[PDB]
A paper describes a structure:
Among the neuronal KCNQ channels, KCNQ2 and KCNQ3 form homo- and hetero-tetrameric channels and are responsible for the M-current, which contributes to the stability of the membrane potential. Each KCNQ2 subunit contains six transmembrane segments (S1–S6): S1–S4 form the voltage-sensing domain (VSD) and the S5–S6 constitute the pore domain (PD). The C-terminal domain (CTD), which contains three helices, namely HA, HB, and HC, interacts with the calcium-modulated protein calmodulin (CaM). Here we report cryo-electron microscopy (cryo-EM) structures of human KCNQ2-CaM in complex with three activators, namely the antiepileptic drug cannabidiol (CBD), the lipid phosphatidylinositol 4,5-bisphosphate (PIP2), and HN37 (pynegabine), an antiepileptic drug in the clinical trial, in an either closed or open conformation.
In the map of KCNQ2-CaMHN37-PIP2(-), no PIP2 molecule was assigned, and consequently, the KCNQ2-CaMHN37-PIP2(-) structure is in a closed state with two HN37 bound, similar to the KCNQ2-CaMHN37 structure. However, we could not rule out the possibility that the two-HN37-bound KCNQ structures (KCNQ2-CaMHN37 and KCNQ2-CaMHN37-PIP2(-)) may present an in vivo transient state after which HN37B will be replaced by PIP2 easily. aThe subscripted (-) after PIP2 in all structures indicates that PIP2 was added into the samples but not resolved in the structures. bThe orders of the ligands in the subscripts of all structures reflect sequences of these ligands added into the protein samples.
Numbering used by the authors:
A (entry chain D), C (entry chain B), E (entry chain A), F (entry chain G): 70 to 184, 195 to 367, 535 to 578
B (entry chain E), D (entry chain C), G (entry chain F), H (entry chain H): 6 to 148
The structure:
C-alpha cells in the first residue's frame, strides 16, 4: 500500500515544511502551545503565583516536548517526499540541515532541563519561538524593504537624530538651572528620546517657559521624523504587496515552460541513461552517426528552451507592456 | 572512455561540412533541415549562444565535448523544472492530471506523439495512477 | 394607489437596508441616539451624577425602544420591495434572517429590562452598537486586507515580538538590582509592552545607566516595529481604495449584460411558463418539432451569453490592457 | 411526464442528423443556419462547452434532457440579472427608463423587434408606468 | 501710465488672492505676525510675564491692525484686475464676498478692542488664523479624502470602538476591587481611551495580573486600530498627490481649447455686439439672409467645440490609454 | 607603475566620495567611531562616570582625529581621479570645496581642543555628525517630498492646529476652576500639545467630567491630525521610491547616448584641437573649403544629437507609453 | 423686437429646404457645404445634439429662436475660456505672447487668416502691447 | 584672428548657394547630400533649430561665427557625456570594455569604421589597457 503511503507523506511534508493555506492552522496551535508555556514561565517568576503556574507549566512543558519530538520525527520521515532526501542517506542529510539541527538541539535541551534551570527554560522558549521562521523569510523581506527604501530611511534617521540632539541641547540649556529633571546633558538626551519617540514616561519634562517653548517648537518636528521610519516601512510593505499581487496575476509563462518540459523529455530519451527508451527515437526517425547527431541537436534544443524560459521568468507590470508594444510597433 | 571520445569526434565531423574545425551557422541550419524541422536565423543564433562561449561566431570541438560530458547532475536545472511544473500546477497542491498533460503537451511547443506523452506520464508518475507529482519528477532524474 | 405604495416601500427599503448616500444621515441620527444612551449609561455608573443621568436615560431608552420597534416593523414591511420576501410567507422568511432575529431579540430584551438591570442595559447597548453592521462588511474588509498583507504583518509581528522580548530581558538584567520597578521579569515585560507600544504610562521606566542605554538602543527599533502593523494596514486600505476606484471606472460590461438580458427574455418567451407569450415566436418564425428546437437553441444561447458575461464580470486595470493588446497583436 | 420526455426525444432526433446518438458541431451549425443566423466555429465551441460536461467533443441526450429539466429556479442567475441591470442602472437608484431600453436593446446584442422590447417593459414593469425596476424583474420570474 | 498700473494690479492680486509660488512668502510673514501675537497673548495670561508680554503685544497688535487694513484696501483695489470686479460697483461686489466681509469685521473688531477685552483679542486671533484659508481648500480636500476612504475609515472606527469598549469593560472587571484607579466604568473608559490612543497619561493603569494580562492582549489590537485612521488618511493624501501629479502631466487638452477659442472669436465677430467687426465677415465671404445663416452656423460651431472641449476636460491616467487603444483597435 | 596607481585612486575616490554599495561599510565604521565618542562625551557630563568615560574618550578622540586627518589627505589625493581636480591647482580647488573646508576646519578645531573645552568638543561632535551628508541629499529629498505634498501637509497642519486650539480652550474652560493643572491658558495649550502629539507626560490631564468628555471628543481628531503629517511624508517617500524604481527600470536611453558619443568624437576629430587626428578626415573623404564645411556639419550633427539625447533624458512611466502609442496610432 | 423675430424666421426658412417645419441633417450638411467646408456625419450629429433637446432627430424653430436669444451672458462659459487660456498659459503667470497665438491659431483647429488673429490680439489685448491676459479676455466680453 | 574669420566667411559662402546672406534649408540639404548622407526634412528642421535662435526660418552668418567660436569649454556638456557613459556603464563601477564599444559604436547611430573606434579607445583610454573610464574621457577634453 504505497499510494496511500506517498499521499500521507506528501500531506505531512506540506503541513510541516512550507505551508500555504489551512496547514498554518496546525502551526498556530503549536505556536499557541509554546506561547502558553512562555506566559506560564513569566507567571513562574512571580513569587505569589509560583505554585499554580509551575504546577501547570511542568505538564505543559512535557506536552510541548512530546509534541516537538513527534513533529521532528514526522518531519524527518516526510522529507522522503522529496527524492533528494530519499533513503537513510537522504533522511540523514535532511536532518543535517542547520534548522533541523537547531530543532533537535532544542528538543534535547528541553529533555535535559526537565530531567536554577528556569533560566535555560526561558532560553529554550525564546529559541523555539525564533524557530517559528525556519527559513528567514521575515528577515529577508525586512531586509529587502529596508534596502529598497534605504535612502528615505537614512533621510528620516539623519533629520530625526539632528532634531533630537538640537531639542535636547536647547531644552537642557533652558532647564539646567531650575529643573532637577535636567541635571546633566544625559538627562536631557533621555528626555528627548522619550519625547520624540512619543513614549513620554513623564519622569522628565520641561517646566520653565523657555524649556516648554523650545519643546513645543521642536517636538512637532521630532515626533514626526521619529514616526517617519515606521510609516516608510509600512508603505513600502503595502506597495510590495501590491506589486507582488500584480506580478502573480502576470505569471504568463505557460508556453516557455511547456517547451522546456518537452525538450527536457526529449533530452532524457535521447541520452543513454536508459536502454528501454526507444519510442522517441522511432518518432524522430519517422519525422525526418545519426543517433549521436540527434542527441546533440536535442540537448541543444533543451538548452535554448531553458534560456528562453529563464529570460521570460521575470514578468513585470509596466516593462512587459512597454516591450510588447515596442515589438508590435517595430513589427508595424 | 576513449570510445565515447571517438564517437563524439565522429559526431562533430558529421556536423562539420566544410572541414574548418568548427560547426558554423550554415551547418547547424542544414542539420536542422535534415532532422525535418526548418530552422530560422534566430534559432541558429540561439544555437551559437548556447554552444559558443568565447564569442567567435562559430562552434568548436572542445566546447561540444565538455557540454556532452555535462549530464543532468551538472545542469542545476531542478529549480527550473520545479517552476515549470508550478506554472503547470494550477492548483498548487502538487498534482497534475494526465489528460491535461496529454492534450497540452501535444499542442504546445515542440509537440510530440500521444505515445511520447504516455511515456511522459510513465516516467514522471512512478505509481502510474495518472496523477503526476512535480517534485518527484524534478528530483527523480535531474537531481 | 399601488404606485405610490411601491415607491414608498422602495425608498424605505433603500434607507433601512443597504444605503448608498444621504440615507446614512438617518442611520447616523439613530446611531447618535444609541450613542447618547451609552454615554448616559456611563454617567449612571458615577454616584454623583446618578440622579440626573438616570432621569434622562429612562426617557432616552424609552425613545430608543420606540424608534427601534418602529424601524423593525418598517423594515419587515419594506422587505416586500424584493419579490423574494413577498406575502406573509416572504415577510416571515425575512424576519427569520439572523440579524433581524438579533434585532427583535434586542428589542424584546430592552422592553423587558425597562419593564441590577443596568448590566443588561449595558449589554444591550453594546449589542445594538454591534448591530450597526448587519452585514459583516467591516469584518470582511478587515479580513481581506489582513490576508492580503498577511506575510508583511507576520514579519512585523515576529520582529517586534523578538524586540520586545530582548529589550525586556536586557533591561530587566540592567535594572533588577537597583530599581523596584523591575522586580520580576513580568514587570520587565509589562514595561516593554507599555514602552514599545509607545503608551508609556510611566509606572515603570529604567533608571540605571545600563537600563537607559539598552532602552534607548532597543526602543527605537521596537516602537517602529510595533507601529508597523498599523501603517501596513492603513496603506493596504488606501491602496485597496485606489484599485477599487480604478476598477469601478473600468466596469465596461454593458454589452455582455445587454446580450444576457436579450437572451434571458428570449428564454422566458420560448419556454412554456406562460401561454400568452407568442409574439416572440412569430418574430422567430418570420426571421427564419420546430418550436422545441427553437426553445432549445434559445436556452443554449442564454447559457453561452451568461458564461460570456460572467467571464467579463471581473474587469481589472492592467490585465485588461495587457490582454486587449495581446488580442490586437495576434490579430495583426 | 412521459409526453415531455417523448417531445424532448423528438427534438433530439430532429437535432440529430447522422444518427450517431449525439448532436455534433455540424448539426449545431446547420440548425443555427436554418434558424436564420449564420453560426461560427467559436459559437459552436461555446455551444458544446455549455452542453458538454464529460469532454467528448459532442452532445449527448441525457445531458440535454437534464438541462431542459432545469427551469429558471435552478439557474441561480438572480445575481447575474441584478448585476446586468445595475450595469444598466446608470443612476443606481433602481429605475430604468423604457425609452433607453427600447433604443439600446434593439441596437445591442441579439437585437429584437420593437414589440419585443414592449414585451420586455410589460413583463418587467408590472405597473406599466414606463419605469422598470431591476430587483422586481430579477425576482419576479427567475426567483 | 496704465500699463504699469495694470501690471502692478495684476501682481498684487496674484499675491493676495490665489498665490502659486513665492507669493506665499508674504503670506508666511503675515502668518508669523499673527502667530507672534497669539503667542504673546498666551504669555499675557501668565501673571509673572504679563508686564513685558503685554507691553510688546500692544505694539504688535497695532502693527497687525495696520498691516491687515492695508492688505484689505490693497485687495479691494487689486480686485480690479478681474473685469468682473470693475468700477465702484465691481469693487463693492468684491467687498461683499463673505470672506472679505469677515476680514473687514475682524479689522473693525480689532480696532474697537484696541480703542476684559483680552477674551475678544483671543477670539480675533483664532478667527484671523481661520481666515488663513479664505477658500475652504483644506476642508474640501479633507472631505474628499475622507469620503473616498469612508468605508475603510468606518471599518477602522467600528473595530477600534469595539476594542475600546471590550478592553475597558474587561479591565474594569479585573481591577474594580483592588485598584482605586478603576472605581467606576467611566474610569475604565477613560483609561481605555487614553491607552488605545497611546497618550498614556499614567493617571490610571492596571495593577492586577488579570488587568495587566487583559490590557496586554487588547492594547495591541486597540492601539493599531486607533492609529489606523491616521494611516489611512495619510496614505490617501499621498495617493491623491500621485494621481494629481500624473493627471497634471496628462493635461493634453491643447487642441480642443484652441478650437474653442477659434470658434469663440468667430461667434464674437459674427454677432452684432459690435459694428466695426467686419473683416471676419469678409473672410467668410471669400472662403465660400446669408449673414444670419453664417451667424447661426458659427454659433453652433462654437457650441459643438465647447462640448468637445468639455468632454476632453477630464484627462485621466489609465482610462485615457484604454480608450485610445480601443479606438485604435476598432480602427484596425 | 601608473595603472595600479590609477586603479587605487579610483577605488579610494569611489569609497570616500559618492559611494554605492559596500563602500558604505567603511563610512558606517567611521560613523560608529564618531558615535562612540559622542556617547562617551555624554557619559563625561555625569560626575559619577566622569573618570572612566573621559579616560577612554581622550584615546578615542585622538583616534578620531588621526582617522579624519588620514581620510582628508586621502580624499585630497584621490580627487586626482577626476581630471578637473588634477595637479596641485586642481587638488587645491578640490580642497576649496565648502564641505572639504568644513572638514579641515573640524580637524583643526579638534586638534586645537585636544592640545571647559568639552563644550567645543560637543560642538565638533555634532558638526562632524552633520558632516555625514556632504551633499545635502537628505535635505534635498525631504524638501522635494514636502513640496510635492505641500497642500496635504498644509491641510493637516491647519486642521490639527485648529483642533489643538479648540480642545485646549474648551478643556481650559472645563478645568480652570477645579484643577491646578489648568491654571492658565498656557497650561491648557501645553496640555493640548502634549496630548495631541500623543506624548502624554501626565503632568497635566483633565480631572473633571466636562474636561474629560471634551478631551475624549477632541483628542480622537487631534491625535489623528497630528499623526497625519508623518503618515503623509512616509507614504510620499514610499511612492517616490516606487516611481524612482520604475524610472530606473525604464532608463531606455542607450541609442541617443550612442549617437551622442559618436558625434562627440566626430566633433573632436574634425576640430583642429589636435594635428594628428586625420584618419577620421580620410574616412569622411572616402564616404563622400571642404574641411571647414565638414567641421561645421559635424559640429551641427553633434548639437542635434545632444538635443535629441537631452529630450529623451527624462524617461517616465505612463507618459512614455502614452506618447509611444500616440506615435504608433498617427503612424497608422 | 419683432424685426429680430422676423429675421430669425427668415433664417430658419433659408435653412429649411423641404419645408417640413424643421431643419434636418441633410439641410445642415448642404448649408455646411455652401459655407465652403465639407461636413461629416458625426459633425451633423453634433449639430443636432447641440440644437436638439427633445430627442426627435431634427431641429425645430422655437429651439433655434431660444438659442439665438441666449447671448454671451447666458453661456456660463467664463470658466471654459479661463481653462482654455490656462492650457495656453504655459507659464501660468497670466501672459500670452502675440506671436505664439498668431502662429498656432492659424495652424490649429478652424484656422483663420493673419488679420483675424491680429483682431484676436486687438480684442483681447486692450492696451495693445502684444501681451494677452486670459482673465481680461474671458471677463471683458463673455462676462 | 583675422585668418580664422576669413576662413569662416569662406565656409559660409560655400554653404551659401543663392547668395541671400543666409544658409537656407535647401542649402543644408544639398551640403548633406554632397557629404554622402541623404538628409531629411526633420533633420534640416533640427539643423535650423540648433543654429537659428531668432526664429527667422534660415541661418545667418553671425550666429555661425559665434557657434564656431564656442569650443568644448563653453558646451557645458560634461554632465551629458557622463550620463551617456553611465548608460553605457552597465556595471556602474566606471569601466567600459573596448570590445563592446567597438562592436556597438560601429553598429549604432552614425556608425564609423573600426579604426575610428580604435581612435575612440586611444583618446579615451590614456593608458591603453582596453578599459575605458567615463570620467577621465568626459573631463580630459571637454572640461
Ligand atoms: C528619527 C530618528 C532617530 N533614529 C536615527 C538614529 C538613531 C540613533 C543614532 F545614534 C543616530 C540616528 C532612529 C529612529 C528609529 C525609529 C529607528 N527605528 C527603526 O527605524 O525601525 C525600523 C532607528 C533604527 C533609528
Ligand atoms: C512571534 C510571532 C508571530 N507569529 C504568531 C503570532 C501572530 C500574530 C499575533 F497577534 C500573535 C502571534 C507567527 C510567526 C511566524 C514566523 C509564523 N510562521 C510559521 O511558523 O510557519 C512556519 C507564524 C505562522 C506565526
Ligand atoms: C510588533 C509586535 C507585537 N505583536 C506581535 C505579537 C504579539 C504577541 C505575541 F505573543 C506574539 C507576537 C503585535 C503587535 C500589534 C500592534 C498587534 N496589533 C495589530 O496588529 O492590529 C492590527 C498585534 C495583534 C500583535
Ligand atoms: C478607532 C477608533 C475610535 N474611533 C471611532 C469611534 C469613536 C467614538 C465613538 F463613539 C464611536 C466610534 C475614532 C478614532 C479616531 C482616531 C478618530 N479620529 C480621526 O479619525 O481623525 C481623522 C475618530 C473620529 C474616531
Ligand atoms: C497637526 C498639527 C500641528 N502642526 C501645525 C502647526 C503647528 C504650529 C502652529 F503654530 C501652527 C500650525 C504641526 C504638526 C506637526 C506634527 C509638525 N511636524 C511635521 O510636520 O514634521 C514633518 C509640524 C511642523 C506642525
Amino acid at each position: 500500500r504505497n499510494a496511500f503511503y506517498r499521499k500521507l507523506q506528501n500531506f505531512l511534508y506540506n503541513v510541516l515544511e512550507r505551508p500555504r493555506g489551512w496547514a498554518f492552522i496546525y502551526h498556530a496551535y503549536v505556536f499557541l502551545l509554546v506561547f502558553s508555556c512562555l506566559v506560564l514561565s513569566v507567571f513562574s517568576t512571580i513569587k505569589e503565583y509560583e505554585k499554580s503556574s509551575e504546577g501547570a507549566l511542568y505538564i505543559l512543558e512535557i506536552v510541548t516536548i512530546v509534541v516537538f519530538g513527534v513533529e521532528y520525527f514526522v518531519r524527518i520521515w516526510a522529507a522522503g517526499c522529496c527524492c533528494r532526501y530519499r533513503g537513510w542517506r537522504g533522511r540523514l542529510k535532511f536532518a543535517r540541515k542547520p534548522f533541523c539541527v537547531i530543532d533537535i538541539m532544542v528538543l534535547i535541551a528541553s529533555i535535559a532541563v526537565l530531567a536554577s534551570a528556569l533560566r535555560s527554560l526561558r532560553f529554550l522558549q525564546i529559541l523555539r519561538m525564533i524557530r517559528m521562521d525556519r527559513r528567514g523569510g521575515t528577515w529577508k523581506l525586512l531586509g529587502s524593504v529596508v534596502y529598497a527604501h534605504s535612502k528615505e530611511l537614512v533621510t528620516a534617521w539623519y533629520i530625526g537624530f539632528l532634531c533630537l540632539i538640537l531639542a535636547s541641547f536647547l531644552v537642557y540649556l533652558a532647564e539646567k538651572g531650575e529643573n532637577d529633571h535636567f541635571d546633566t546633558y544625559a538627562d536631557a538626551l533621555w528626555w528627548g528620546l522619550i519625547t520624540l519617540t512619543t513614549i513620554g514616561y513623564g519622569d522628565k519634562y520641561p517646566q520653565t517657559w523657555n524649556g516648554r517653548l523650545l519643546a513645543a517648537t521642536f517636538t512637532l518636528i521630532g515626533v514626526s521624523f521619529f514616526a517617519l521610519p515606521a510609516g516608510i516601512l509600512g508603505s513600502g510593505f503595502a506597495l510590495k504587496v501590491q506589486e507582488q499581487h500584480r506580478q502573480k496575476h502576470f505569471e504568463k509563462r505557460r508556453n516557455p515552460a511547456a517547451g522546456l518540459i518537452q525538450s527536457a523529455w526529449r533530452f532524457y530519451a535521447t541520452n543513454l541513461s536508459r536502454t528501454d527508451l526507444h519510442s522517441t527515437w522511432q518518432y524522430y526517425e519517422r519525422t525526418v552517426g545519426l543517433k549521436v547527431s540527434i542527441r546533440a541537436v536535442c540537448v541543444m534544443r533543451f538548452l535554448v528552451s531553458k534560456r528562453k524560459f529563464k529570460e521570460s521568468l521575470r514578468p513585470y507590470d509596466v516593462m512587459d507592456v512597454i516591450e510588447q508594444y515596442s515589438a508590435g510597433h517595430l513589427d508595424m | 572512455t576513449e570510445e565515447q571520445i571517438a564517437e563524439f569526434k565522429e559526431a562533430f565531423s558529421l556536423f562539420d561540412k566544410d572541414g574548418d574545425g568548427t560547426i558554423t551557422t550554415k551547418e547547424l541550419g542544414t542539420v536542422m533541415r535534415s532532422l525535418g524541422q526548418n530552422p530560422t536565423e534566430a534559432e541558429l543564433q540561439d544555437m551559437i549562444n548556447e554552444v559558443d562561449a568565447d564569442g567567435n561566431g562559430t562552434i568548436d570541438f572542445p566546447e561540444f565535448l565538455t557540454m556532452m560530458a555535462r549530464k543532468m547532475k551538472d545542469t542545476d536545472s531542478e529549480e527550473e523544472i520545479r517552476e515549470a511544473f508550478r506554472v503547470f500546477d494550477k492548483d498548487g497542491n502538487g498534482y497534475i492530471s494526465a489528460a491535461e498533460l496529454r492534450h497540452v503537451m501535444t499542442n504546445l511547443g515542440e509537440k510530440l506523439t500521444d505515445e511520447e506523452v504516455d511515456e511522459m506520464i510513465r516516467e514522471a508518475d512512478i505509481d502510474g495512477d495518472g496523477q503526476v507529482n512535480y517534485e518527484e519528477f524534478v528530483q527523480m532524474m535531474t537531481a
